[PDB]
Design a protein around this ligand. Sequence first.
Ligand SMILES: C[C@@H](Oc1ccccc1F)C(=O)O
Length: 165
Amino acid sequence: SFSGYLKLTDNVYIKNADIVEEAKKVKPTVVVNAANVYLKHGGGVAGALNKATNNAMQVESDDYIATNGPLKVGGSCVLSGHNLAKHCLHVVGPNVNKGEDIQLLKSAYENFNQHEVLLAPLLSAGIFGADPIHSLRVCVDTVRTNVYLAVFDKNLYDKLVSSFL
Ligand SMILES: C[C@@H](Oc1ccccc1F)C(=O)O
């Protein structure tokens, strides 16, 4: 199970870790993917999770999109976790680099409330363009279930912990 996490609140924990390495180690029930509406797992967390599954996550995602169409920004879908987790909760946070409404980040985090425990990245942070300090604040103010946040960047992890209020 989860180890070496810093407790931020009653239900939010954080660690400086590669979410792929963390998923392979723990084999959580749910690993969250930082997805886009098309489930095109090209870069960031999505590209790294997909590569770890030997592209099985992308093949499965393309079948999902062919059947259901794209997700909504702020929405999610539950797919297989392949070799990384029981399930992968693909959550679409707003991409501010594409002019998506940052207010949709709270709706994106609300998807975590349907799962008792999750391994997750900070939504809309990194290549999605939003402020990670703001993403952590929305996470702790929205998620009520047990969330274990994996922050890849050490300098960001330190800044998130030192500025947490
Ligand atoms: C949210 C994401 O942020 C970064 C990733 C890579 C470089 C810089 C970052 F600020 C993370 O560390 O998990």
